[PDB]
Amino acid sequence: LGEDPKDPGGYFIINGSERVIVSIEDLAPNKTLVERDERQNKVVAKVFS
Amino acid sequence: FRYTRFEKARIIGARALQIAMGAPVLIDVPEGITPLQAALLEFEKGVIPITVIRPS
Amino acid sequence: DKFASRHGQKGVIGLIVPQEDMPWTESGIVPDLIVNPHGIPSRMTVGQLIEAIGGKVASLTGRRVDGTAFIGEPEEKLRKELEELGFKHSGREIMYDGITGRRLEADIFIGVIYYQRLHHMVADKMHARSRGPVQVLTKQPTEGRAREGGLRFGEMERDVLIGHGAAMLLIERLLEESDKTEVWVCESCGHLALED
Amino acid sequence: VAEKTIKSMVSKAELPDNIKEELYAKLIEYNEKYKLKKDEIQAIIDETVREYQKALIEPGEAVGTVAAQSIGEPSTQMTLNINVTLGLPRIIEIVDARKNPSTPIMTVYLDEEHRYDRDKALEVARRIEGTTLENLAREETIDILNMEYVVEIDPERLEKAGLDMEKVVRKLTGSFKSAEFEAEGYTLVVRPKKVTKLSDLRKIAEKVKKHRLKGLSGVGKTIIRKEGDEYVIYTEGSNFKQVLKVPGVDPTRTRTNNIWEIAEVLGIEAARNAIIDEIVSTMREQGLEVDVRHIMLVADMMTLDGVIRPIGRHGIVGEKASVLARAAFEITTQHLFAAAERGEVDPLNGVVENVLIGQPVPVGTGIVKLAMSLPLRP
Amino acid sequence: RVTSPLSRDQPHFEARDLHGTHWGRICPTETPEGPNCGLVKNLALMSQI
Amino acid sequence: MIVPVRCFTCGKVLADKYYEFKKRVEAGEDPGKVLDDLGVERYCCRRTLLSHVELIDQVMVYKVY
Amino acid sequence: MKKVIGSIEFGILSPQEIRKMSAAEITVPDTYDDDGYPIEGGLMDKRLGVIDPGLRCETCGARAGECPGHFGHIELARPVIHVGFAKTIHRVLESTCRECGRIKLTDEEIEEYMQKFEVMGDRKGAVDKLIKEIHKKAKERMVCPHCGAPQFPIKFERPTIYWELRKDEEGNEYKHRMMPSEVRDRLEKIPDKDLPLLGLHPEKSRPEWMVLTVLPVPPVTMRPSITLESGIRAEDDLTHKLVDIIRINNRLKSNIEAGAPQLIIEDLWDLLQYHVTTYINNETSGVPPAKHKSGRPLKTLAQRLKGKEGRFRGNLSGKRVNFSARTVISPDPMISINEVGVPLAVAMELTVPEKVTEFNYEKLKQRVLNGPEKYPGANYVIDPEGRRIRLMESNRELIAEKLDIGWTVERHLEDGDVVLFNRQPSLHRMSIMAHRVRVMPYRTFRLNLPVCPPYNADFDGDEMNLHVPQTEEAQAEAKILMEVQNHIISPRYGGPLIAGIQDHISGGYLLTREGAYFTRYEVEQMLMFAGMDVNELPEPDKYENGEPLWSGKTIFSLLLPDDLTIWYRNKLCDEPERCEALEKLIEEKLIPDPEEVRKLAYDGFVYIQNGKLLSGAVDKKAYGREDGKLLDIIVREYGVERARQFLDQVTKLTIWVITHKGFTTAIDDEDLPQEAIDRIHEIIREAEEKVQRLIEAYKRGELEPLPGKTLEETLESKIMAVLAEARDNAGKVAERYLGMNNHAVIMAKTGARGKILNITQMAAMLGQQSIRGKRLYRGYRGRVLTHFKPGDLGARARGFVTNSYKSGLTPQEYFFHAMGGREGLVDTAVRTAQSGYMQRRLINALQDLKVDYDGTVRDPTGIIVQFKYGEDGVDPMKSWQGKTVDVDRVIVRTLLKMRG
Amino acid sequence: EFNIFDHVLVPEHRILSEEEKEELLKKYRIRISQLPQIKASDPAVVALGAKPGDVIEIKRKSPTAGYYYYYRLVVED
Amino acid sequence: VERIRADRRAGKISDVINVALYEDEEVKEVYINSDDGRVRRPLIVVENGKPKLTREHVEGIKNGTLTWSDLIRMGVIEYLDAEEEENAYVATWPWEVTEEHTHLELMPAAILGIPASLVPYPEHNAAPRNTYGAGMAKQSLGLGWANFRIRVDTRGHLMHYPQVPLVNSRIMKAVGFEDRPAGQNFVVAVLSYHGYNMEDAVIINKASIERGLARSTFFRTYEAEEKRYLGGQKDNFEVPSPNI
Ligand SMILES: [Mg+2]
Ligand SMILES: [Zn+2]
Numbered sequence A: 001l002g003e004d005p006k007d008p009g010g011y012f013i014i015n016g017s018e019r020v021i022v023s024i025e026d027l028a029p030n031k032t033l034v035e036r037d038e039r040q041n042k043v044v045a046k047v048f049s
Numbered sequence B: 001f002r003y004t005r006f007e008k009a010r011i012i013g014a015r016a017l018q019i020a021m022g023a024p025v026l027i028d029v030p031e032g033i034t035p036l037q038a039a040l041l042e043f044e045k046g047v048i049p050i051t052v053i054r055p056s
Numbered sequence C: 001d002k003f004a005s006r007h008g009q010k011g012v013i014g015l016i017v018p019q020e021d022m023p024w025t026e027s028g029i030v031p032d033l034i035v036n037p038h039g040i041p042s043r044m045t046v047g048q049l050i051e052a053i054g055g056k057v058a059s060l061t062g063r064r065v066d067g068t069a070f071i072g073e074p075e076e077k078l079r080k081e082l083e084e085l086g087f088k089h090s091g092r093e094i095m096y097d098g099i100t101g102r103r104l105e106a107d108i109f110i111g112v113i114y115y116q117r118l119h120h121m122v123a124d125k126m127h128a129r130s131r132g133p134v135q136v137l138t139k140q141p142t143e144g145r146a147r148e149g150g151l152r153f154g155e156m157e158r159d160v161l162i163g164h165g166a167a168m169l170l171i172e173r174l175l176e177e178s179d180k181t182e183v184w185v186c187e188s189c190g191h192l193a194l195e196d
Numbered sequence D: 001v002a003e004k005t006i007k008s009m010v011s012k013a014e015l016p017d018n019i020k021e022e023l024y025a026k027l028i029e030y031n032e033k034y035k036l037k038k039d040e041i042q043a044i045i046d047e048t049v050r051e052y053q054k055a056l057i058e059p060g061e062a063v064g065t066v067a068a069q070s071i072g073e074p075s076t077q078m079t080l081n082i083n084v085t086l087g088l089p090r091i092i093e094i095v096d097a098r099k100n101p102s103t104p105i106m107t108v109y110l111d112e113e114h115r116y117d118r119d120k121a122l123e124v125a126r127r128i129e130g131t132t133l134e135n136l137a138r139e140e141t142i143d144i145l146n147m148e149y150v151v152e153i154d155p156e157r158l159e160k161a162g163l164d165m166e167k168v169v170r171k172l173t174g175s176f177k178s179a180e181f182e183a184e185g186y187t188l189v190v191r192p193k194k195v196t197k198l199s200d201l202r203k204i205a206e207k208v209k210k211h212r213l214k215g216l217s218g219v220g221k222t223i224i225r226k227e228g229d230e231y232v233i234y235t236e237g238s239n240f241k242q243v244l245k246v247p248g249v250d251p252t253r254t255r256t257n258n259i260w261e262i263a264e265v266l267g268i269e270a271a272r273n274a275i276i277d278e279i280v281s282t283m284r285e286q287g288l289e290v291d292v293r294h295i296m297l298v299a300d301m302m303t304l305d306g307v308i309r310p311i312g313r314h315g316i317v318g319e320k321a322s323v324l325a326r327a328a329f330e331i332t333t334q335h336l337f338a339a340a341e342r343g344e345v346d347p348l349n350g351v352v353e354n355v356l357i358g359q360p361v362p363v364g365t366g367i368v369k370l371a372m373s374l375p376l377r378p
Numbered sequence E: 001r002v003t004s005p006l007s008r009d010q011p012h013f014e015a016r017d018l019h020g021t022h023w024g025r026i027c028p029t030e031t032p033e034g035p036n037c038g039l040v041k042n043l044a045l046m047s048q049i
Numbered sequence F: 001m002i003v004p005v006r007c008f009t010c011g012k013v014l015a016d017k018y019y020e021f022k023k024r025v026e027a028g029e030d031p032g033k034v035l036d037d038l039g040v041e042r043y044c045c046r047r048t049l050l051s052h053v054e055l056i057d058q059v060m061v062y063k064v065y
Numbered sequence G: 001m002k003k004v005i006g007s008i009e010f011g012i013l014s015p016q017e018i019r020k021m022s023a024a025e026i027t028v029p030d031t032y033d034d035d036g037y038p039i040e041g042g043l044m045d046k047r048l049g050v051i052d053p054g055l056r057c058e059t060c061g062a063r064a065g066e067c068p069g070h071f072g073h074i075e076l077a078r079p080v081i082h083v084g085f086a087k088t089i090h091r092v093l094e095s096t097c098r099e100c101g102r103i104k105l106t107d108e109e110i111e112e113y114m115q116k117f118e119v120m121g122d123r124k125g126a127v128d129k130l131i132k133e134i135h136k137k138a139k140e141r142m143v144c145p146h147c148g149a150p151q152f153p154i155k156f157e158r159p160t161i162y163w164e165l166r167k168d169e170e171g172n173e174y175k176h177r178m179m180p181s182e183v184r185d186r187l188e189k190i191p192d193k194d195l196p197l198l199g200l201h202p203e204k205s206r207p208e209w210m211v212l213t214v215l216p217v218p219p220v221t222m223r224p225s226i227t228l229e230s231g232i233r234a235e236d237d238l239t240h241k242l243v244d245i246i247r248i249n250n251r252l253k254s255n256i257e258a259g260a261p262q263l264i265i266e267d268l269w270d271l272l273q274y275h276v277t278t279y280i281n282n283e284t285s286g287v288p289p290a291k292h293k294s295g296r297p298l299k300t301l302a303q304r305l306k307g308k309e310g311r312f313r314g315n316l317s318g319k320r321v322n323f324s325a326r327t328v329i330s331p332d333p334m335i336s337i338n339e340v341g342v343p344l345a346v347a348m349e350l351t352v353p354e355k356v357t358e359f360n361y362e363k364l365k366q367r368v369l370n371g372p373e374k375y376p377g378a379n380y381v382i383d384p385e386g387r388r389i390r391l392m393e394s395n396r397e398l399i400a401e402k403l404d405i406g407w408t409v410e411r412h413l414e415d416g417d418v419v420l421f422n423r424q425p426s427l428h429r430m431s432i433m434a435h436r437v438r439v440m441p442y443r444t445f446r447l448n449l450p451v452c453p454p455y456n457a458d459f460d461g462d463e464m465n466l467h468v469p470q471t472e473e474a475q476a477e478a479k480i481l482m483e484v485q486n487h488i489i490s491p492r493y494g495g496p497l498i499a500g501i502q503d504h505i506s507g508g509y510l511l512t513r514e515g516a517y518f519t520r521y522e523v524e525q526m527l528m529f530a531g532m533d534v535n536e537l538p539e540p541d542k543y544e545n546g547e548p549l550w551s552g553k554t555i556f557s558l559l560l561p562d563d564l565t566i567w568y569r570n571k572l573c574d575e576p577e578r579c580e581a582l583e584k585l586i587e588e589k590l591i592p593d594p595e596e597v598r599k600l601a602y603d604g605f606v607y608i609q610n611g612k613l614l615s616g617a618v619d620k621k622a623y624g625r626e627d628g629k630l631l632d633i634i635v636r637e638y639g640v641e642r643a644r645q646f647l648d649q650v651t652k653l654t655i656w657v658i659t660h661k662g663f664t665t666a667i668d669d670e671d672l673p674q675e676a677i678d679r680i681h682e683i684i685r686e687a688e689e690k691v692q693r694l695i696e697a698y699k700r701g702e703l704e705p706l707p708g709k710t711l712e713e714t715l716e717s718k719i720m721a722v723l724a725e726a727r728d729n730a731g732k733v734a735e736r737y738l739g740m741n742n743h744a745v746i747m748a749k750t751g752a753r754g755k756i757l758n759i760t761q762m763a764a765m766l767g768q769q770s771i772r773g774k775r776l777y778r779g780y781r782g783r784v785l786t787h788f789k790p791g792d793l794g795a796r797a798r799g800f801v802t803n804s805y806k807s808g809l810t811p812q813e814y815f816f817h818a819m820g821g822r823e824g825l826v827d828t829a830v831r832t833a834q835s836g837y838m839q840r841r842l843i844n845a846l847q848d849l850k851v852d853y854d855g856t857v858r859d860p861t862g863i864i865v866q867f868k869y870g871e872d873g874v875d876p877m878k879s880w881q882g883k884t885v886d887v888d889r890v891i892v893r894t895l896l897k898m899r900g
Numbered sequence H: 001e002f003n004i005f006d007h008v009l010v011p012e013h014r015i016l017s018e019e020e021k022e023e024l025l026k027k028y029r030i031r032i033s034q035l036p037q038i039k040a041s042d043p044a045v046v047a048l049g050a051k052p053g054d055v056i057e058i059k060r061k062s063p064t065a066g067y068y069y070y071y072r073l074v075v076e077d
Numbered sequence I: 001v002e003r004i005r006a007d008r009r010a011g012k013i014s015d016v017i018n019v020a021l022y023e024d025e026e027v028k029e030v031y032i033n034s035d036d037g038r039v040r041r042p043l044i045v046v047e048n049g050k051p052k053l054t055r056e057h058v059e060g061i062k063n064g065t066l067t068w069s070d071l072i073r074m075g076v077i078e079y080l081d082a083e084e085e086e087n088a089y090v091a092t093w094p095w096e097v098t099e100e101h102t103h104l105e106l107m108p109a110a111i112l113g114i115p116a117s118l119v120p121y122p123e124h125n126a127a128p129r130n131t132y133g134a135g136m137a138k139q140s141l142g143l144g145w146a147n148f149r150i151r152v153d154t155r156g157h158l159m160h161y162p163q164v165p166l167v168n169s170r171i172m173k174a175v176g177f178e179d180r181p182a183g184q185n186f187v188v189a190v191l192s193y194h195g196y197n198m199e200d201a202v203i204i205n206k207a208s209i210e211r212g213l214a215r216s217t218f219f220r221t222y223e224a225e226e227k228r229y230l231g232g233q234k235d236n237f238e239v240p241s242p243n244i
């Protein structure tokens, strides 16, 4: 089929050009993370729902 | 009296511009040099006619 | 042309030296590459020397040398087999100068190092523009090398030209060579006059 | 050669005052070593005069641009990260004229009665040091049976603050007339006059902690070092006005990192000197040598109007007379619109405006004027 | 390849630097240079998702 | 993808003895002795023979015309 | 004749001026029809200019590429508040009465403010302060001093919404929206005499012009339209914004003419105001930016003017230039510091325009007769009248026969031509210098090695640019001012910048070290290689095996001038007794005998007497960057040309020495005996025992807090100090067990390349890995890695690497070193941007400072920044180690000159 | 009390007379608005008892020239 | 937590579930994670100082009777995320296991990435040097793909005689770099030669270059489309006439 046997795959071909989706290191969804802002002198907790 | 680097550069540039469009050389030439080299030899021979106006 | 080792040692080719001018060892080996000794200890690259020793050992014995992290062949073992192969432990070899023909006073460290050619070749990186196409908006040279663009004289270049005190050079660079033009100005109000 | 002849020759030499005395001292030192003759001394003076004439800077040099480049170039190779926050952030803070620098540190010098013994240095440091009872406190506990703070403090910390607990009470009896303060051994107990709500308890408990028992406001850490057989106190925070008038602190050598405090206390000239000294010290700490002339020019430009100004859009560039100079660097839209509102006229006497237009810049060869005699006869 | 949503021009001292939890999950050495340093990482050889 | 004709260091011909060397290697013999009996003594020629990998057979399968 | 722009006067464009400057009226919100022709009355009208080559402009009759473009005007149905002046408008709305129109100040106050304005001068800060004070004083007055009418507070809502706080008959306070028509009517009542009090020009900045009634549509040239590869025209963002503005204005006009109710008119007015606000500035706060149909936000005039990619920075302050090349650089020690290696392909492309004169007529005629495909040749010929002709094969001889005096020939780059050589980033003025063209048939640039430290350029794929000046004035300026040899001394610190590095230092040490002797053939070969004018060999120092031998100091002495004498100490000083003896011997006699000096000569004390290197070894202290005393003295006392010749000769000589004597590094350079390894292991055990004892003392509570510090960071600092002492001891042991015969030790000690710590790290230990100035702590809870127990504060568990590079690191230690290296790389990658921003800020703050002819530094306004530059009028470049005049050096040199 | 001129960071300050001010203006060919400014609320100014409109002559320690003479103009805040 | 771990090791529940226990003096919590995006690593379970992986399992793996998923099924090797590993005590080497150790590292060299494993002996090099070597491993030229000739990549490079390095990590054989090499082995001698190798530069042999060493070919692909416009107009593939 004209394909290299050593090619791992795992990418997309859009308009004849190979496209790879780089993974994204994001925060844990629906998880509350707590930290303290030294400049603001406050305790802040954030959740990305 | 001494010539500053900026004054010397301005004098050489003016002399080269004059030589490029006229102003025959006051000294001998090596038959093939650029007008900048002609101005350089004119300065080295101490024959330049261009003076520098200084505030006073 | 950019050539790089596997240990971060990179550089361009400085000279294409003929084989007759290159030095050779007592065993009859002419190096395919010559690197400066100043770069090895400044960057703390001992893995390159270990790889050279391992490559020489692998070439002499015929068995590939394992270079895996933390489980690779020990350096001292490699020096031991290099000694058993008839060569110096340190990998240094007695070399003769290719021009004078005399023996070098220092034993030169020569070994097999995996060097890879990079895609930053000088053929695709040389750009030279005298005059050509200009942008339709700013009447300035185009961008890049594919469309015969110019070279950018940025703000820093202008600043260092000012610091050099070269007023006419700056005028020639920024104005007389990039977007020189003539306009008509009205002296009464300062507006741009129209020429029909 | 007699010393009088050497002095007369040095005075007759066309040299600056600082060069004259140094040259005379060196000639005196070398005269006994090698028995210099009069002609040798005259030749030495002539060579010194020629070297001074050669060392003079030619007119038209772009000293501001050269100074900016010579200051910014070592910053590309500086090292990032007590608490002196030196390096590139220190230089950035200095050139930006920060009102409150990060981790302010003041250098305190003592008089002859406190710089030779450790006890007086420690006592004057504790006089400078601003110690609050919250730092002296060890455990925090708010009860309900008396509904007020019962403060218990460790004695060891009280061994360093150099004051008794009862006198500590005297620091809040007068200050807080709405509450009664009682001392029970090593425990501090407060009593309420008319308090019945929890809201006002939280509006008055923190006022005791924020109150300062002794020292100066804004003073944190305090250390004492031995330099040149002298005791030098280094503190955290800038309280120059309240630390200059201290009974035991020498006020002729005290300095602080806050250049604004020096400007408001010691004058704008001392502020410029402190800016120069701080930049020189920051450059020397990183091992990068920068000529002091560039720093001096930068500090002179910063303090041109009698106040400390930054180098950004709110400082030297902000008060630039040229519209195009201000617009090219920062806040282009609002600067141009404000110039249109004011009807400002740009004389184009600067360098960047002539660069933008296409006229020769007024620096270097752009300032050279030439004259020509037309009848050239080779 | 793994990227991060953080801006490249931002100095992220606590985020660009290597973490102790990257052992066996993120390659400790293979990172790009310039503004992409730290924010762009590569999966370790033993990393499993 | 194919074995070089000459050694990169001294120009000694090695493509003639490469296939014999590869065949003897696949038989289980020590490649050092195989190089020794084939006259490959200098380690530069040994470098050229050992480090080369054949890949032309995987390129011929993709016809271009 | 010719005229130049003496000054620029700014102001606000009046509607009458916009109408007069407009060559057309725009009413059709379209650009092109189906066939592609412009629509009459549209934005792409030929009256505003032409971009397509076929079309011809209606206003001026010129074709594309030469028509400057003409503005147009749009008559808005209702006035629209200009956003850029909007806040300023509010200030005027807080300063003038709503009925009389005069300012809210008394006549005496007005007169006093006029005297204050006249007195202060032209400083901008004082004017802004006075304007703010006047506005603050006038905004708090609710009664007009001239008319007595009551005033109401005005609330400004971003960006162009004005609210007036009015009171009803019942006393209720409400907000009335001030329409732009009402605002313009109020602004029209302000007389010209009150405008200077508001900071507005009476004849240039009338407040009523701050509300836009006529919109100036830009010319076609300034917003060009292009045709894509698919045949579909790609309109500009400004064109789309103007299309939307015209459509909304036409709808508003139609609704007004139709008698639409007030709800319609104010809604369309708000839409038009938003469109005009986005057209002036699409990044205005409080409004949504205008977006394309694809979701891409547009950039309008404000974004075109501001920003890094804006016109001011990306097109005016810095722009792309012609006659420039850029490619990779490769080393070339065989050329001088004044020369640059220009490729033949680059040389045949970049052309120098040379006018035909009476002395270069034959050379330029030969250049024309060679053609563009033959070197040396020419590419273009310009006649005196001014027509440029490209040289092809057909007209190559015809143009050559037609060449005369006054013609210009764009000849190829020849040897000796002056060109600029710049490497980016240009942090200092020494980042570009004018070199001489050397044409070689290869592809890459070639630059001499001593010029690399000024450029901060190595040869690991570095890219460098070259600029060819065209005018004679520019060439002369480059040749005189920015020549390479004229910038040997760095003005930043007054020390040598163009200096020998690496192999130059190593070869100098190898040549000038004790016991270094060379044969007659070697001496002749190095003399020929260095290009020295040594006609006859000097007397040999000694004879070995019947053949003559020359000391390397004798060969080095030929480089120095015959009247040079200087003594100092270098970095190779480890026995101060010999240096002290040499200093004492020099101090007594002041002309010591060369035999006496050679009896007690030491490599650690460099002494040159009358140009003869009697003692000392060459290192970075001789002619290295920021340290070379000999090069610094040579530049200052013998000029720059002699210094350049000396630098070239010494670099070639040291390269010859290091090439044929043999310089190399191997794996045994870092090798240590078993005793050194045992000592290092003992130091390791002692350090770990001390760290464990400190941890136990902290746990048991007997550890003493530092003054002002608690237990944690005190213990951390103690552990770090112990590890630092252990590292220092290991480095001292490694230095003790590594002699001077080691080439790596030679490079480290001489200052050529590397440091002593680099050899220590490859031989003894890696030390402690630290992040942000403290020990490694980021990781799991209580530990960095899971291979250690939680809560462990030991050295091995916190980043202290015990083994070196030669012994190999453990995987945990490898990870710790990876964290350290990542921290370092991030530190540089963060520091570069901040340093560049600070450099730009400093440059823009100090761009206009210049020393005048009287020695004073003044701003363009005229304020004397400094009455004398540096308080002494001395260039830092010409200063001696930051001092005005080195009296010691001058006295010593003059005394030696008179004694000799 | 504590004199502000005793500090090592504070250079010497003196009051220029009208004749000396005119000489200073003549020497550098500059107007009174082209001099460096010093605020009237500056502690050195209030120590000297100066008023706006005068010129303060500053003798400063010079790291490169020993002693340097700067000139400032007193202006209102 | 112990019951969940035992059930996961017994194969009753899926290996995706990871359990961790946080036991502080103030708060105590148990976390169970079974979602996406969790990067985990395989670790050999060690009980009573003895790893679960025995020689029989290795023999079965080598013989092909046992697979990796089989080893995961019996709980000999388990995947640990960052949360669970907080409760784990990993041993770097099989000879360093103790009674208190809870896990054994499979391959310490596997903590590096795919390009980072190309560097031979990375522990003997500086960290910035290793980073540069890993970054430049992707910029090398070689026979990356066997179907490069039929590919239509806009830019590509080919090494005429690519060579597998003589000093290579064992992972590179498993990764596939040995089958697709991207460089050559160079006989390098460390020596100063006329100053032309100065400042990171290198000196190459003319005869070596002429013999085909490091020879490369660069392919560039151009595309042309006969696009159709509105009204039936379209491009034509023909030699243009000089009159146009
Ligand atoms: Mg580089
Ligand atoms: Zn060979």
Ligand SMILES: [Zn+2]
Residues within 6 Å of the ligand: G048, G049, G050, G057, G058, G059, G060, G061, G062, G067, G068, G069, G070
């Ligand atoms: Zn027109």
Ligand SMILES: [Zn+2]
Residues within 6 Å of the ligand: G097, G098, G099, G100, G101, G102, G144, G145, G146, G147, G148, G149
């Ligand atoms: Zn009124």
